[PDB]
Ligand binder design. Structure first.
Ligand SMILES: O=C(O)CN(CCN(CC(=O)O)CC(=O)O)CC(=O)O
Ligand SMILES: O=C(O)CN(CCN(CC(=O)O)CC(=O)O)CC(=O)O
Ligand SMILES: [Cl-]
Ligand SMILES: [Cl-]
Ligand SMILES: [Cl-]
Ligand SMILES: [Cl-]
Ligand SMILES: [Cl-]
Ligand SMILES: [Cl-]
Ligand SMILES: [Cl-]
Ligand SMILES: [Cl-]
Ligand SMILES: [Cl-]
Ligand SMILES: [Cl-]
Ligand SMILES: [Cl-]
Ligand SMILES: [Cl-]
Ligand SMILES: [Cl-]
Ligand SMILES: [Cl-]
Ligand SMILES: [Cl-]
Ligand SMILES: [Cl-]
Ligand SMILES: [Cl-]
Ligand SMILES: [Cl-]
Lengths: 411, 412, 411, 407
């Protein structure tokens, strides 16, 4: 009478219930997850595995809120109380009974990072995967070796693969990424929507919306007369030391930037969360504004006159605006010398100069116009390759597609 | 008080019974295994995860068959039928119900390699570990990376440490080794018995027993008029290609060795189980003798006039005989250039010459006595550092220790 | 070492879970129930094995609702949606996860009948048994033969003894009952609270509460000028015939009772659940009121000018009111001729006449004050033996015992 | 994965881990498939394994001669204390070997009930010889059974379960058949009226003077003396003091008959080792533990019994019987709790005092004429059926049965 798989689960759950394991919520879900639980107008959102309300899901959501308030919107979070969601969406805490109800019921899953393999994406449901940016470093399959603790390359890749096979829909911002995903994610071009990122929507539809460039600016208490510079270096293992209490000042040399640019500029510093609540910005008030904790990074872009980064997929997002970029790669030699661990030729076809010391960077920074002119060539070359595909309608395209998928399911 | 461990095993075992899983024998054992099971006069032996009747545990056991024949002797094998054990030992097949009774009951485990962590070594029993050679490559905790599929370096070292912590006694051949075990295996000097390897007993006790040497030689159908070169390279992953059906002839070049040394010598080829049954010694009959499957390596050392290896710990055992050794390291370049990946300075303090090419090896082999004087300096020095401790009396020291351990247990 | 009792339960539970047995809830309970589940201020109630909200456990629960609202009250039923409980108590259905949780946590059980042997009464827990009436017929240990199916006399006695051994306190109404309980129940005088029946409080406290008599009288649509007779015979197996679709009219002859008293009296029939829904009362309306399903038997006693019974322990409770009783023992012949199957001498020391034919009865029932005087002797003697204990503070004594018992534990 | 197999599976996990003794049984229950049956294996047991005796014996002895070729198995409580001739191997009850035997056999031969935890598959032919013509009513025909631990309905139920598995049931007479068809819930089609295999030697040997001689000197009996057998059934009433001499008055019998007779006492196993027979040496022989009872009847010139089914066996020899019913009042005054009319149609006199009994015993030949009538009426009602070829009939039937299975 009893099937073998149900049995294995039946025991697992007996063990979680009697030993008071916290995963009892999960095992129950495994036993009772039926293809019949799906409610065609329940859609579940989650971004970066629950840290945020943010990114492509946010916008795919905000659009679907203005055009179909009639559906049941659920968001998932690590700490639902510490997040704020506009509209009629209800929120669920990761790993609670509600969390699993939601994922079981939903006809659609919107997400921008991997969702856990312990969740059944039934053949009954559509998992739309937006991902979170054009790749610069190699990921998934294309990685060579991965000495990540607790997990080995083959196992890590087997698992990443089990997860992409669940992607009914994978978004792409460009053929560069489409070409890449196909190999890296074990995808079939059939399922890749080359429609651009919904989070990048507002880079197209608002680049000139002054009352809105002003909300952002006066939200951050930014000076009335000063142009904006964003700096966003990627995380580097290296630089962590001594409990993470007192850091050494940024290599970009802040005291310098204050001397050279303090009159004409202000610098939005966007660091990793560990450098940030370790950074003392005493006596840089109204010059360096810490911006690492700001929810929506696309808004930061809209108000920036240029973007200093190093090895980061954000250059591909900012490029939509065709503004100048500088690449402050002080540790470019420690990074393989001439590394092909990069899907692109970093040494040639990015839209700005590569600086290793931060002083000719600052000087150059004085006159943006000379840089915009000098590099207009490489900046447009960049815009056609990696940015020429966003409509401003990406949130629309996905949201509509959902809707469409859910009229059919309504027959 | 609810016993949360006992619960986890009753479930696991219910699972194995209902699903017809083969580990059902294992999970019963785990559920039911009490200290009260141990029979002070039961002793288990296993060598190389149950592949052989061989090595230290063989000798530790042969000694005991002769001086304490009244204890219950159980040997463990992957395939007991395909193994022949002298004396009174009963044999158990691994992962069979008897395998488990035998380890549950035994007051002493003897092994020369790792025994599985699913077996419970109660506070009640004594796990004596002999290991299987003086370390040259670095092992266990001393390793840097281990891209061994299925397991990550931390979780492999974790497990190893789990195993060594169960070693009540660990045998050692030399102060060199001891220093290393204490680190590589997480050992406390208290538990190390620097007494030499029981398997190396015959290398001392019988090295000049002519009649015994002759049983070994004629058991191997060797010429009478010819001296013996043994060749034992280690396993190389690199050299594997094409299903393991037709290897390329050994780098040592048999054809050349034949021309050069065919008149005075015969060469004993001791390879890995794979390079062996791919080899075609057609037309090297009575010169190249395949000897890969010969159960007792120590008997081979005894009849061997010199040894050729590369990076093997067998060089430390054969050193006991103060005979010549050549090191054909054809691929020394592809092993890190200058590799401290060894506990010793491989380029300097070993008992013979290092050859990267097999042709000047052959020549140098034509006159063993020159090599023996040329290197008597180094051969002796290598003996003082790695072989000085072997008594000949090592199966005795373990045999004794055990019996002495098991009178104590037959009183209070 | 190996905990064998636990092993036995783990196997049992594994068995129920895999086979989809309804008792899986029970066996989980047995495996996990532990002394530390007991919340000192949780108290379970149940009456007659979960049939009602009624009897002593009710009058205990209602008293603690007034003076000790702070505690957690749980009531147990077969069908909780079909029972109504005033106050703060939660209702658990029998044999359900919440029922077992309830008995696992409670510091005190209250019941008036036997509670199942599969519930563990930990040393931790105080089990109060109020029982449900002064014995007439002989019960438990004092029985001679019990040919009840599937179970032999020894095995029945063994299980009853198992139950009484967990009664931490047993209520008794009179020395006569104590004498008996002590033997029939294998009880220690020490554990017998001889305080009367809580369910019988109102017969002391409220006999004269003219406004309360009325709520009860108009609850039953009783005519105004008419006096009230209550007939309540015990169940007789012999009489059951024909699936229970049509009984031969009651031996008491309602047709006659109408002609004789249909002007002055109304008669309240309290019968067994099978005789009651087989009774045709066409044309006895406003004379014969079926009152079998009435929830509170004491309220009926209060408004009863006299009780007609036969071999029931109700004669004992109704005695507190010192009103007249008639014993219509039509079948006294069949019951042994001269049976000592009764703890008391039925033939001699009861508070009224033994009629074996219902015609003399009716006549006598015409003039009630003549009966009252004729027996005001036998009636007082009976009240001095069986009813002289109830101060109507019985519900209180128990509530305060519990409340005291659970102050001690809170330290 | 079946629900029945899962229940057994769990049971065995329990028995094995708790080292219960029924581990041997739960295993049997798990692995017992129809495929285990070996057509030429036959199991014998008599009285639940206390003996090598009775009908199963004679069926076995007969097949030991005409079919030495089959595998014969006998089941005992204490195999090391029983002597079995011929090829048969033996099994101890509730051992691995016992469940083997019973799973493997194509035929079970027994004379009393065999346990319900044993699986009688469609594959197997269970033959019940039972053990005697009923005088006390049994099984379904019982009124009340206050046997401790169990209830009348649950007892009749379990018995009905056992008889439902008797493929063949043996019967000594129409009178028994009548009673079996009702008392054991039996089909008349399944009853073989052939008489008792164990009575075979009462027909075939009664005049074998050399056999009679072995039996007689086996017991060290005197040569000039005739032989009386006394076989009073058991009475619960009479157990006391963890005894009092027999109500038959051995002293009197020794006085009145000691010079012509010798008296064989066949008692219940409990009165046997409470009896002191000092000073009756060579008059009263205790014969209560003698393995074979048909050999006793053979050498008995008469039988003194009371309420026992042995009168029906001994009848075959048309010899005088006596019925010392000293306590026939306690036994219900006039009880029809008997299938027959005791007070009438039995082959002998009902005595209630032992003294007129002793006198009548003096001259057997006069007893034998006085009663020739009633003795014949008795041989005709209850013993006419016995061929002396019963053992033969089963033996062959089994042989005849297992030539079929062999195709
Ligand atoms: O019978 C089990 O529940 C326990 N088993 C089986 C594995 N468990 C672990 C799990 O929860 O994933 C479950 C199982 O696979 O049935 C072994 C374990 O505890 O490590
Ligand atoms: O009843 C059974 O299913 C078997 N067990 C009981 C089954 N339970 C224990 C219990 O119900 O008493 C656990 C198990 O399935 O064995 C009794 C036996 O030995 O015949
Ligand atoms: Cl829906
Ligand atoms: Cl022992
Ligand atoms: Cl094998
Ligand atoms: Cl460990
Ligand atoms: Cl080797
Ligand atoms: Cl358990
Ligand atoms: Cl509490
Ligand atoms: Cl309900
Ligand atoms: Cl309610
Ligand atoms: Cl009562
Ligand atoms: Cl009526
Ligand atoms: Cl099934
Ligand atoms: Cl069983
Ligand atoms: Cl066969
Ligand atoms: Cl029987
Ligand atoms: Cl059966
Ligand atoms: Cl019988
Ligand atoms: Cl006597």
């Amino acid at each position: 009478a009893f099937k073998v798989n149900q049995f294995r689960k039946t025991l697992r759950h007996v063990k979680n219930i009697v030993l008071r394991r916290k995963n009892k919520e999960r095992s129950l879900y495994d036993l009772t997850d039926k293809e019949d639980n799906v409610k065609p107008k329940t859609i579940v959102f989650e971004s970066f595995g629950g840290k945020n309300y943010s990114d492509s899901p946010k916008y795919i959501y905000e659009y679907m809120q203005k055009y179909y308030p009639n559906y049941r919107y659920i968001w998932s979070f690590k700490n639902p109380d510490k997040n704020v969601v506009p509209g009629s969406a209800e929120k669920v805490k990761r790993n609670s009974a509600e969390y699993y109800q939601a994922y079981s019921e939903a006809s659609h899953w919107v997400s921008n990072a991997r969702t856990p393999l312990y969740l059944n994406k039934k053949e009954n449901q559509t998992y739309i995967q937006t991902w979170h940016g054009t790749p610069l470093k190699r990921l998934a399959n294309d990685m060579k070796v991965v000495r990540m603790p607790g997990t080995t390359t083959p196992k890590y890749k087997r698992n990443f693969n089990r997860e992409t096979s669940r992607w009914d829909y994978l978004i792409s911002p460009n053929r560069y990424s489409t070409e890449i995903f196909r190999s890296a994610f074990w995808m079939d071009e059939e399922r890749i929507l080359e429609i651009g990122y919904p989070r990048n929507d507002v880079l197209v539809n608002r680049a000139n919306d002054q009352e809105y460039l002003d909300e952002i600016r006066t939200h951050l208490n930014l000076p009335s007369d000063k142009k904006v510079i964003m700096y966003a270096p990627t995380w580097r293992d290296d630089e962590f030391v001594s409990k993470g209490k007192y850091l050494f000042e940024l290599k970009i040399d802040l005291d310098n930037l204050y001397k050279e640019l303090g009159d004409d500029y202000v610098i939005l510093l966007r660091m990793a969360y560990l450098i940030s609540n370790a950074l003392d910005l005493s006596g840089y008030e109204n010059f360096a504004i810490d911006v690492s904790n700001y929810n929506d990074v696309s808004e930061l872009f809209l108000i920036s006159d240029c973007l200093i980064t190093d090895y980061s997929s954000v250059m591909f997002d900012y490029g939509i605006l065709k503004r100048p970029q500088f690449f402050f790669a002080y540790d470019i030699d420690k990074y393989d010398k001439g590394l092909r661990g990069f899907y692109m030729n970093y040494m040639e076809d990015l839209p700005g100069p590569i600086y290793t010391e931060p002083y000719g960077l600052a000087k150059e920074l004085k006159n943006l116009d000379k840089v915009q002119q000098q590099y207009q060539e490489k900046i447009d070359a960049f815009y056609d390759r990696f940015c020429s595909v966003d409509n401003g309608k990406a949130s629309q395209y996905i949201g509509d597609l959902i809707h469409k998928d859910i009229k059919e399911q309504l027959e």
